Write an enzyme that holds these catalytic residues in place. Structure first.
Site, PDB file in Angstrom:
ATOM      1  N   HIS A  40       0.821  -1.210   0.000  1.00  0.00           N
ATOM      2  CA  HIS A  40       0.000   0.000   0.000  1.00  0.00           C
ATOM      3  C   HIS A  40       0.863   1.271   0.000  1.00  0.00           C
ATOM      4  CE1 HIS A  40       0.125   0.359   4.522  1.00  0.00           C
ATOM      5  NE2 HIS A  40      -0.039   1.634   4.218  1.00  0.00           N
ATOM      6  N   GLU A  52      19.562   6.323   8.213  1.00  0.00           N
ATOM      7  CA  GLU A  52      18.910   7.514   8.758  1.00  0.00           C
ATOM      8  C   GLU A  52      18.642   7.429  10.244  1.00  0.00           C
ATOM      9  OE1 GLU A  52      18.420  10.277   7.597  1.00  0.00           O
ATOM     10  OE2 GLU A  52      17.692  10.343   5.525  1.00  0.00           O
ATOM     11  N   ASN A  54      17.820  11.188  12.186  1.00  0.00           N
ATOM     12  CA  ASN A  54      17.017  12.374  11.938  1.00  0.00           C
ATOM     13  C   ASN A  54      16.816  12.524  10.426  1.00  0.00           C
ATOM     14  OD1 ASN A  54      16.094  15.070  11.517  1.00  0.00           O
ATOM     15  ND2 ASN A  54      16.734  15.566  13.598  1.00  0.00           N
ATOM     16  N   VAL A  57      17.914  16.068   8.856  1.00  0.00           N
ATOM     17  CA  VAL A  57      19.279  16.563   9.033  1.00  0.00           C
ATOM     18  C   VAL A  57      20.240  15.546   8.441  1.00  0.00           C
ATOM     19  CG1 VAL A  57      21.078  17.240  10.697  1.00  0.00           C
ATOM     20  CG2 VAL A  57      18.667  17.738  11.207  1.00  0.00           C
ATOM     21  N   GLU A  62      24.176   8.495   6.097  1.00  0.00           N
ATOM     22  CA  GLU A  62      23.118   8.175   5.154  1.00  0.00           C
ATOM     23  C   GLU A  62      23.660   7.602   3.852  1.00  0.00           C
ATOM     24  OE1 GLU A  62      23.617  11.292   6.554  1.00  0.00           O
ATOM     25  OE2 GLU A  62      21.734  11.844   7.529  1.00  0.00           O
ATOM     26  N   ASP A  84      -0.223  -7.496   1.746  1.00  0.00           N
ATOM     27  CA  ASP A  84       0.296  -6.123   1.745  1.00  0.00           C
ATOM     28  C   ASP A  84       1.813  -6.156   1.882  1.00  0.00           C
ATOM     29  OD1 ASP A  84       0.507  -3.386   1.715  1.00  0.00           O
ATOM     30  OD2 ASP A  84      -0.293  -3.095   3.754  1.00  0.00           O
ATOM     31  N   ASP A 171       1.299   1.673  19.993  1.00  0.00           N
ATOM     32  CA  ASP A 171       0.918   1.145  18.680  1.00  0.00           C
ATOM     33  C   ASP A 171       1.774   1.798  17.615  1.00  0.00           C
ATOM     34  OD1 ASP A 171      -0.682  -0.186  16.691  1.00  0.00           O
ATOM     35  OD2 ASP A 171      -2.440   1.097  17.086  1.00  0.00           O
ATOM     36  N   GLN A 174       0.104   6.135  11.401  1.00  0.00           N
ATOM     37  CA  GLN A 174       0.318   6.674  10.055  1.00  0.00           C
ATOM     38  C   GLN A 174       1.759   7.105   9.883  1.00  0.00           C
ATOM     39  OE1 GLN A 174       1.207   9.841   8.308  1.00  0.00           O
ATOM     40  NE2 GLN A 174       0.852   8.484   6.541  1.00  0.00           N
ATOM     41  N   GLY A 175       2.382   6.679   8.785  1.00  0.00           N
ATOM     42  CA  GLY A 175       3.763   7.027   8.521  1.00  0.00           C
ATOM     43  C   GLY A 175       4.744   5.929   8.891  1.00  0.00           C
ATOM     44  N   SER A 177       3.865   2.786   8.194  1.00  0.00           N
ATOM     45  CA  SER A 177       3.540   1.728   7.236  1.00  0.00           C
ATOM     46  C   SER A 177       4.737   1.321   6.414  1.00  0.00           C
ATOM     47  CB  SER A 177       2.427   2.173   6.297  1.00  0.00           C
ATOM     48  OG  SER A 177       1.189   2.203   6.975  1.00  0.00           O
ATOM     49  N   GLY A 178       4.841   0.013   6.182  1.00  0.00           N
ATOM     50  CA  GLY A 178       5.926  -0.531   5.394  1.00  0.00           C
ATOM     51  C   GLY A 178       7.138  -0.900   6.214  1.00  0.00           C
TER      52      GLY A 178
HETATM   53 CA   LIG Z   1      19.517  12.189   8.242  1.00  0.00          CA
END
Ligand SMILES: [Ca+2]
Length: 223
Positions: A40, A52, A54, A57, A62, A84, A171, A174-175, A177-178
């Site tokens: 989804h 990652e 932050n 920043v 990274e 899914d 829990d 949103q965000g 997911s995946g």
């Molecule tokens: Ca970063």
């Protein structure tokens, strides 16, 4: 993640952020060239962001790598979220190191009661919205199907499991997911869906990765 804690930078080195100008979903690194996430979360123009903490920043660890191919599960059903799960191939291999590392796939499924680590950059509020910059973490147990179904009235399939706390307060959201659900060192779940976040009798629903390991392995071997 609601009711969790700040993980600590790069302490979840398999966690990725999927970025299309902004973070929109999590994912998990499963080898140097492949990420697994939720179907989804599918969209074009994905950049995978590894190493990652932050997400606003540049901290120095990274790796940003564009997706070359996305493969939504052949049987993904967007109305029910059955199956899914999605694979993303990177255009170039990630350089693996202590902050950028794969997570092992399960050889067998996990059971009710087993504790798992769920992580992400999703909403941290059960009412309203606040999005964190640094990665959040939550320890949560797998719930039995019968307890989950009876408490929630959710319609789920054998390709899903519930995890969390029926009392509410802790829990995914949103965000997230995946992103990963790791139990006993194996990727057993992918953050998939729910109703609100951290509400009483409404636990999180997760894709049951152990049912997909054959598809994951064969798909990667052929692509
Ligand atoms: Ca970063």
């Amino acid at each position: 993640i609601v009711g969790g804690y700040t993980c600590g930078a790069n302490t979840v080195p398999y966690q990725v952020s999927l970025n299309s100008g902004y973070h929109f979903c999590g994912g998990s690194l499963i080898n140097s060239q492949w990420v697994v996430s939720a179907a989804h979360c599918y969209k074009s123009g994905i950049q995978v962001r590894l190493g990652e903490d932050n997400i606003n920043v540049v901290e120095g660890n990274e790796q940003f790598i564009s997706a070359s191919k996305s493969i939504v599960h052949p049987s993904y059903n967007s109305e029910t979220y059955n199956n899914d799960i999605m694979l993303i191939k990177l255009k170039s291999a990630a350089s693996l190191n202590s902050r950028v590392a794969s997570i092992s796939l399960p050889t067998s499924c996990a059971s009710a009661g087993t504790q798992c680590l769920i992580s992400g950059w999703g909403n941290t509020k059960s009412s309203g919205t606040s999005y964190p910059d640094v990665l959040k973490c939550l320890k949560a147990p797998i719930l039995s199907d019968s307890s989950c179904k009876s408490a929630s009235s959710f319609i789920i399939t054998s390709n899903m499991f519930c995890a969390g706390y029926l009392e509410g307060g802790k829990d995914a959201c949103q965000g997230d997911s995946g992103g990963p659900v790791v139990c006993s060192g194996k990727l057993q779940g992918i953050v998939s869906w729910g109703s609100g976040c951290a509400q009483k009798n409404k636990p999180g629903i997760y894709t049951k990765v152990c049912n997909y390991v054959s598809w994951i392995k064969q798909t990667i071997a052929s692509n």
